[PDB]
Amino acid sequence: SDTQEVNDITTLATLHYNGSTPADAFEAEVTNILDRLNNNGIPINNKVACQFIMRGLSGEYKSLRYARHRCIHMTVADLFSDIHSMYEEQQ
Amino acid sequence: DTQEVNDITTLATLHYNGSTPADAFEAEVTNILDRLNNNGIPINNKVACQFIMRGLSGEYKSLRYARHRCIHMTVADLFSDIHSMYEEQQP
């Protein structure tokens, strides 16, 4: 509660996703961290968010990381689309 | 282009046990906070204080009991206490 921002930032910096849990749940976790950080006056822009998410991708999802260099132009929604697409074509 | 992610990761993984000068530790953290501020990721006194406390090891772990007042405690005040402990430990 008093440590929500520190916990949210720590989570963001230590994300991991390998497809073994629903992509929706991963998207929710990340989305809400970003929302809460925004509310607490710590705005994480699209580029930085994208980089944290990419860093977290393991297993087959590692492959999405070769777009990390375009994070500036890539939207978080676009990235989540690709993760969702990969999740679907693993199920 | 990954300066923010690197600066946040460092903040979230600080370690200090007195084995290096307190001035160097202060410098590292201060400049992370400065750069994050510049890049539109403003870490306030409370959150900064919490990250610093989390990183204290060895004899310095003991300082982690003012953590609850980080809201009212300043980063400068905490670095004072670390400096004070560092001085005591020196010849």
Residue numbers in the entry:
A (entry chain A): 261 to 351
B (entry chain B): 262 to 352
The authors write:
Given that Ty1’ CA and Drt2 also encode p18-like domains and to understand if they had the same Dimer-1 properties as p18m, we expressed Drt2m and the equivalent residues in Ty1’ CA-CTD (Gag coordinates M259-Q351) and determined their crystal structures. We observed p18m higher order aggregation through a weaker Dimer-2 interface that was ameliorated by introduction of a Dimer-2 suppressing mutant (F323S). Therefore, we included F323S in Ty1’ CA-CTD constructs and in Drt2m F323S/Y329S (SS) for crystallographic analyses and F323S/Y326S/Y329S (SSS) for biophysical analyses. Inclusion of serine substitutions reduced the aggregation tendency and improved solubility necessary for structural studies. The asymmetric unit of wildtype and Ty1’ CA-CTD (F323S) crystals both contain two monomers arranged through a single Dimer-1 interface and the Drt2m(SS) crystals contain four Drt2m(SS) monomers arranged as two dimer-pairs through Dimer-1 interfaces. Inspection of the structures reveals all helical domains with arrangements and packing resembling that of Dimer-1 observed in p18m and confirm that the F323S mutation does not alter interactions at the Dimer-1 interface. 3D comparison of the Ty1’ CA-CTD (F323S) and Drt2m(SS) dimers also reveals the strong similarity with RMSD of 0.5 Å over 160 Cα backbone atoms. By contrast, in Drt2m and Ty1’ CA-CTD, it is the V266 sidechain on helix α1 that closely packs against F312 on helix α3 and because of the greater steric bulk of the V and F residues the distance between the V266 and F312 Cα atoms is increased to 6.8 Å. Concurrent with the increased spacing in the VTF interface of Drt2m and Ty1’ CA-CTD, the side chain of the conserved residue R315 can adopt a rotamer that allows it to swing in and hydrogen bond with T270 which is not possible with V270 in p18m. Thus, this “arginine-flip” mechanism provides a further level of discrimination and specificity between AVL and VTF Dimer-1 interfaces.
